């Protein structure tokens, strides 16, 4: 989920976050997790869905 719409970037009040979201198979995460781009995301294995 890119976080933008055709009207520009989606409000984090409406959406919940601001940037990219991987789409997972987990409810109770809302089938989304934040794409981690910090300097710790390659310290372990990424676990892509």
């Amino acid at each position: 989920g890119t976080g933008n719409s055709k009207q520009g970037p989606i409000s984090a009040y409406k959406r919940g976050y601001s940037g990219d979201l991987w789409i997972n198979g987990a409810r109770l995460d809302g089938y989304v997790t934040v794409v981690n781009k910090s300097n710790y995301s390659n310290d372990e294995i990424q676990e892509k869905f």
Binding site: A26, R27, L28, D29
Partner: protein, 469 residues
């Protein structure tokens, strides 16, 4: 998330008094008692007759009130750390919605007895997992069941002895394998006891030892330790659990029938409808691959022998992030080098294996359906069968009981001793590279070499694998 004063259903190391503990609800139907496991006698290092391996002993640890509120802040920071992992709170929700079948109206098989300011037992609170402190042994993370209902189909309340203060460290990477990696490994195993699957009794060979004895694991231990080869669930004509799946299926698919046999609430009957909606395929294929960390690149090979794989040098403390310095490290073999002494390789391996030599010969196979089932060697998400949002909308009310307490005795494990061989080798071995590759001097005086037969002989030189380095 309530907090009660609980009159416990056990007695503190043979005191025969009522044990009144302060329980806290850290997840729905998941209670934390941040006191040590009072039911086994808390000893010091000098009081223990035959100590376990990698087994730091210490009294007075959660007797203090300040450092036992530091223990609750370590459980509450751990369940908040499982919740922040993908599929993490769907495991915690599976544990929340795994309420065992009631023995009677109310629940005198799964509840903690709550008591007022004075000790008048006024109501009891529904528990699935009670998350106790360490026992006598500080790193002995166990999953003590309340009843023997875990092998019955009813499901049993589970006491989870767990210590977040002792961690395994990737020594090459300096990444600490987190506390919650063994907590998710035990909440997984709690699901097989809360569903009444008798998968903790039969132990299957997993690691042949040096006398052709087997380090054996249960189907609970095998499934809960994440991905692993020799899968329980290797479909190739389902082989594992020879004539034992038919027992586990009869335990599951009979308890699904007796679901309105005894009525407790409109919410206890509503969680029990949602409990047997997670099918038996989903339990045996629980993968917590997204929740455990890939800190140790091999964690899905061994059968939870992370401390033996990495060595005891990797066992550290949470507050210090250095070695424990008080664990009894009793090796299996002391391999000593002849041409220069003090090059000992202490081989911490396993001993006292089971005698399962006639296991792969007497292997019964189930009656196969003669169907190739298209499978995929990676794990699966299996919580799509779990009614995970429907569990979270159900909070079970407190039940007015005012009935007296039934006490259940706790008889611990009787561990065998580790007899240490003292081997003296006249020749370099693979084990004597560990001794040779370590050193205790600075760069000006290190004197590296690329030869075992000089590092092992001198005790001034250090082994390396590349003459340029």
């Amino acid at each position: 998330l309530k907090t009660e004063n609980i009159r416990y259903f056990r007695t503190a190391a043979g005191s025969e008094d009522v044990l009144e503990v302060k329980a806290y609800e850290v997840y729905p139907n998941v209670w934390a008692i941040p006191s040590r496991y009072m039911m086994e006698p808390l000893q010091d290092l000098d009081e223990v007759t035959n100590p376990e391996q990698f087994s730091i002993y210490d009294k007075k640890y959660l007797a203090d009130i300040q450092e036992q509120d530091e223990f609750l802040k370590s459980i509450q920071a751990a369940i908040e750390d499982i919740k922040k992992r993908t599929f993490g709170l769907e495991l915690l929700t599976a544990v929340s919605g795994a309420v065992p079948l009631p023995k009677d109206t109310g629940a005198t098989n799964t509840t903690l007895q709550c008591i007022d300011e004075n000790g008048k037992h006024t109501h009891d609170v529904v528990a699935n997992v009670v998350l106790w402190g360490p026992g006598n042994n500080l790193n002995s993370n166990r999953l003590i069941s309340k009843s023997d209902d875990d092998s019955n189909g009813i499901g049993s309340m589970v006491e989870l002895i767990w210590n977040p203060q002792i961690l395994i460290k990737n020594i090459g990477t300096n990444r600490i394998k987190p506390a919650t990696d063994e907590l998710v490994g035990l909440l997984t195993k709690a699901l097989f006891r809360l569903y009444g699957l008798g998968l903790n009794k039969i132990r299957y060979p997993f690691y042949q030892l040096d006398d052709k004895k087997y380090y054996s694991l249960t189907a609970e231990d095998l499934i809960s330790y994440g991905g692993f080869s020799a899968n329980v669930v290797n479909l190739q004509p389902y082989y594992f659990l020879e004539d034992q799946f038919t027992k586990v299926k009869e335990k599951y698919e009979s308890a699904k029938k007796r679901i309105d046999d005894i009525k407790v609430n409109d919410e206890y009957s509503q969680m029990l409808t949602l409990k047997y909606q997670f099918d038996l395929y989903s339990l045996f294929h629980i993968s917590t691959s997204y929740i455990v960390s890939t800190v140790i690149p091999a964690n899905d090979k061994y059968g939870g022998l992370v401390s033996y794989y990495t060595g005891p040098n990797a066992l550290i403390d949470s507050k210090t992030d250095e070695k424990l310095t008080s664990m009894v490290k009793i090796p299996l073999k002391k391999i000593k080098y002849s041409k220069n002494q003090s090059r000992e390789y202490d081989e911490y391996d396993l001993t006292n294996g089971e005698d399962s030599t006639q296991y792969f010969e007497n292997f019964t196979f189930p009656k196969s359906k003669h169907v190739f089932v298209e499978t995929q060697p990676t794990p699966e998400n299996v919580f799509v069968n779990l009614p995970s949002e429907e569990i979270t909308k159900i909070i079970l009310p407190v039940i007015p009981a005012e009935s007296d307490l039934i006490k259940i005795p706790f008889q611990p494990a009787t561990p065998k001793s580790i007899t240490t061989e003292l081997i003296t080798t006249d020749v370099p071995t693979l084990g004597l590279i560990f001794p040779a590759v370590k050193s205790k001097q600075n760069l000006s005086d290190i004197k590296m070499t690329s030869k075992l037969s000089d590092a092992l002989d001198s005790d001034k030189q250090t082994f390396a694998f590349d003459n340029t380095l």
